[PDB]
């Protein structure tokens, strides 16, 4: 009711492909104890997509869920964060700008830094709107996480997008100016040009992620004096739900049991959707935010939400948001639950067939798919989308 005009997330939604495989079914096919997936890494259902669906398909569907005609006129910047690009030059944001019917006098571009790309976009969006509060920015995380059949990373796979509308007087989450950022040159996870799957140093990945949180948390506490007791919930980027828990558990071990129980319970709420989707790379943290807000029943306006973003390479950031009065009226619980529940369960055979298929863009072809914004054709390497 006082002070500077707030800036932050006005609306937020995710989209995942209309297919999944059950992790017990996957475990039985890979001759491993299902507990390895359900408990070990903490995953239950995994999102999978056909070659007729790419990051534009997911970004467009996610964004369509939150954009009004008014938004489309007020948006003058469109940003896509991804590490699953389909062009080395042309930003995925340009096609998204067209499909969403956003007004022409806007800048559009793509950000790349592993799983951190969308966060970078969000912070830049926040600064833009702070300086131009009559404008809005569309920021979309979009990615496809594939590792290969019978591969070590297979059970953490996923696909989809998370779209955010950034505005002044946001109806969901007001962003604070307490950002703590961190860059370290570490080769825990990367994907050289020409590699369809990432190069991974498994142990280094877990180590770097866990310590990166510790580093930005400690620096944040030093700068602000804020501690776990000052946070009503914490949302994390996660490669899989158990790794987030590990990082969190390691840092909160010296807190009162009351604080641990509280923070840990909130974390469980934040991963409800993730357990049913898998890794969204850039979108994982923001799926967690959605999951937290739509599954919690005792969060309320005025509460402080801490967010930890991570990107292999590695870049990390911790920042805070405050829940806005009335935010519970502007979520999409019914829509999201329906999206997850309405998915078709694939058998492992069907999944392997879908996964193995490759899109060769050098061949002119048509593709069939009932989903809006799916790929309808390739011509001279150019993708057309049905709308």
From Swiss-Prot:
Pathway the protein takes part in: Metabolic intermediate biosynthesis; (R)-mevalonate biosynthesis; (R)-mevalonate from acetyl-CoA: step 2/3
Binding site for (3S)-3-hydroxy-3-methylglutaryl-CoA: 33, 115, 156, 205, 237, 246, 279, 312
Listed result of changing residue 114 to G: 140-fold increase in the overall reaction rate, and 86-fold increase in catalytic efficiency
Activity profile over pH: Optimum pH is about 9.8.
Activity regulation (record text): Is sensitive to feedback substrate inhibition by acetoacetyl-CoA. Is inactivated by hymeglusin, which also blocks the growth of E.faecalis, indicating the critical role that the mevalonate pathway plays in isoprenoid biosynthesis.
Domain of life where this protein originates: Bacteria
Top EC class for this record: transferase
Reactions the enzyme catalyzes: acetoacetyl-CoA + acetyl-CoA + H2O = (3S)-3-hydroxy-3-methylglutaryl-CoA + CoA + H(+)
GO BP annotations, alphabetical order: acetyl-CoA metabolic process; isoprenoid biosynthetic process
Molecular function terms, GO-annotated: hydroxymethylglutaryl-CoA synthase activity
Residues making up the signal peptide according to the UniProt record: none
Temperature dependence: Optimum temperature is 37 degrees Celsius.
Keyword Acyltransferase attributed: yes
EC number(s) given by UniProt: 2.3.3.10
Keywords linked to the UniProt accession: Acyltransferase, Isoprene biosynthesis, Transferase
Any one Pfam family match given in the protein's UniProt record, by short name: HMG_CoA_synt_N
Residues at the active site: 83 (proton donor/acceptor), 115 (acyl-thioester intermediate), 237 (proton donor/acceptor)
UniProt similarity note: Belongs to the thiolase-like superfamily. HMG-CoA synthase family.
Subunit annotation: Homodimer.
Function: Catalyzes the condensation of acetyl-CoA with acetoacetyl-CoA to form 3-hydroxy-3-methylglutaryl-CoA (HMG-CoA). Functions in the mevalonate (MVA) pathway leading to isopentenyl diphosphate (IPP), a key precursor for the biosynthesis of isoprenoid compounds.
PANTHER family membership: 3-HYDROXY-3-METHYLGLUTARYL COENZYME A SYNTHASE, HYDROXYMETHYLGLUTARYL-COA SYNTHASE
Protein name from the UniProt record: Hydroxymethylglutaryl-CoA synthase
Organism annotation: Enterococcus faecalis (Streptococcus faecalis)
Gene that this sequence comes from: mvaS
């Amino acid at each position: 009711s006082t002070g500077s005009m707030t800036i932050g997330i006005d609306k937020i939604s995710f989209f995942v492909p209309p297919y999944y495989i059950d992790m017990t079914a996957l475990a039985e096919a890979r001759n491993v104890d299902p507990g390895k997936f359900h408990i070990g890494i903490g995953q239950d259902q995994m999102a999978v997509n056909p070659i007729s669906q790419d990051i534009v398909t997911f970004a467009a569907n996610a964004a369509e869920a939150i954009l009004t005609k008014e938004d489309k006129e007020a948006i003058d910047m469109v940003i896509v964060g991804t590490e699953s690009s389909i062009d080395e030059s042309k930003a995925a944001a340009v096609v998204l700008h067209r499909l969403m019917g956003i007004q022409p006098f806007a800048r559009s571009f793509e950000i790349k830094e592993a799983c951190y790309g969308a966060t970078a976009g969000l912070q830049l969006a926040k600064n833009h709107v702070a300086l131009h509060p009559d404008k809005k920015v569309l920021v979309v995380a979009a990615d496809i996480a594939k590792y290969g059949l019978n591969s070590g990373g297979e059970p953490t796979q996923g696909a989809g997008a998370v779209a955010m509308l950034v505005s002044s007087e946001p109806r969901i989450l007001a962003l604070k100016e307490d950002n703590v950022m961190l860059t370290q040159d570490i080769y825990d996870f990367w994907r050289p040009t020409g590699h369809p799957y990432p190069m991974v140093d498994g142990p280094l990945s877990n180590e770097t992620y866990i310590q990166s949180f510790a580093q930005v948390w400690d620096e944040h506490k030093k700068r602000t004096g804020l501690d776990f007791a000052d946070y009503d919930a914490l949302a994390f980027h996660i490669p899989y739900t158990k790794m987030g828990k590990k990082a969190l558990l390691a840092k909160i071990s010296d807190q009162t049991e009351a604080e641990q129980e509280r923070i840990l319970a909130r974390y469980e709420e934040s991963i409800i959707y993730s357990r049913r989707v898998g890794n969204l790379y850039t979108g994982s943290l923001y799926l967690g935010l959605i999951s937290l807000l739509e599954n919690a029943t005792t969060l309320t306006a005025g509460n402080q939400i801490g967010l930890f973003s991570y990107g292999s390479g590695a870049v990390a950031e911790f920042f805070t948001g405050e829940l806005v009065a009335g935010y519970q009226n502007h979520l999409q619980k019914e829509t999201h639950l329906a999206l997850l529940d309405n998915r078709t369960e694939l058998s492992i055979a069907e999944y392997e067939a879908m996964f193995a298929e490759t899109l060769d863009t050098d061949i002119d072809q048509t593709l069939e798919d009932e989903l809006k914004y799916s790929i309808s054709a390739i011509n001279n390497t150019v993708r057309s989308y049905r709308n």
